[PDB]
Structure formats: C-alpha cells, structure tokens
Amino acid sequence: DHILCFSSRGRVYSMKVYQLPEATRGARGRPIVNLLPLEQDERITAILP
DNA sequence: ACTGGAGAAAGAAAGTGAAAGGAAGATAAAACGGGATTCATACACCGTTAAATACCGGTTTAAAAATCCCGTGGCGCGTTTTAAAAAATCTGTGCGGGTGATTTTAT
C-alpha cells in the first residue's frame, strides 16, 4: 500500500509500507529521519493509507 | 695611445631543502542494542449474586440555532524566478600480438 505522511509544517511525503523496518516485539525501532528528509524539529503527525 | 678580445669580479634573480601546522584523514576502546534460556508468579477463563444503571411519560426553559446587513482581508490570475530531475555527452579499461626500456643482493 501507499503511505502519505503529513509533517508539522504542512509537508507531504510518499512511501511504500514494506520499506519500513521490520522488528520483533521486544525491539525498539529505527529513527525515521533516515527514511525521509525531515528537518531538525519536524515530526510526522498524520498517515493516510 | 688606442682598440678589441678575453678572462676574472661582482652583483642580482631564480631554484632549493627544510619548515609548523592544520584540516583530513586514518585506526582501537567503549558503550550500545538485539537475540537464546528459566522459571515463579501474576494473569486468563469459569459459576454466583447485590447493586448500579438504562429506560419510559410529560414539562420547561434557558440556551443555541436561524436570519439580515455589511465590510473587509483571504483566495484567484497572470507572469517571473529557481532548484530538481532527465537526457546527452565524455572518460577509463581490458582483451592479444608488437616496439622499446628499468632494479637489488653475495663473494
């Protein structure tokens, strides 16, 4: 599926679901800055499949 | 005395070997984060019941919804900039026969 990410400054980004890290129940995850060109204080606040 | 060639002195410009140092790299120790076990222990599922809550009938009333006039700033259009992505153009490289060349040790 496609994913539309809305940031805190009105920006929009597109990304496939299977490009996200896959982990287990006890893991933590990976920072999202490595996947999208965000700024120093820009956060994702909405997702639309 | 005078002339013109030649050798030697003297002076100025260019090449040189050595120079801190600093950004630019490079290499180890450390702190970190993600799997295999091991249970005791707290959590999931099953019968019982007092109690707390949902629901119906009829008011009401104060609050929110609806309506009209108007005056603006927030979108819309047309025309420029400006990064960003794409297409086009150069740069190396190795295959196998040919031409010609380099270096270090012992006695």
Side-chain angles (χ1 to χ4, degrees):
Chain A
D1 274 327
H2 294 73
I3 287 300
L4 299 181
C5 301
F6 297 86
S7 67
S8 178
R9 301 186 299 101
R11 313 285 291 186
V12 179
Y13 310 94
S14 181
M15 178 178 50
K16 277 294 191 302
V17 181
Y18 58 84
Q19 304 185 19
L20 298 179
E22 159 70 28
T24 59
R25 187 171 66 94
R28 176 183 175 183
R30 303 264 66 91
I32 205 178
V33 61
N34 305 129
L35 300 180
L36 299 178
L38 299 183
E39 295 184 359
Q40 72 289 345
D41 50 358
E42 192 176 12
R43 318 187 321 274
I44 303 299
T45 177
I47 299 180
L48 172 64

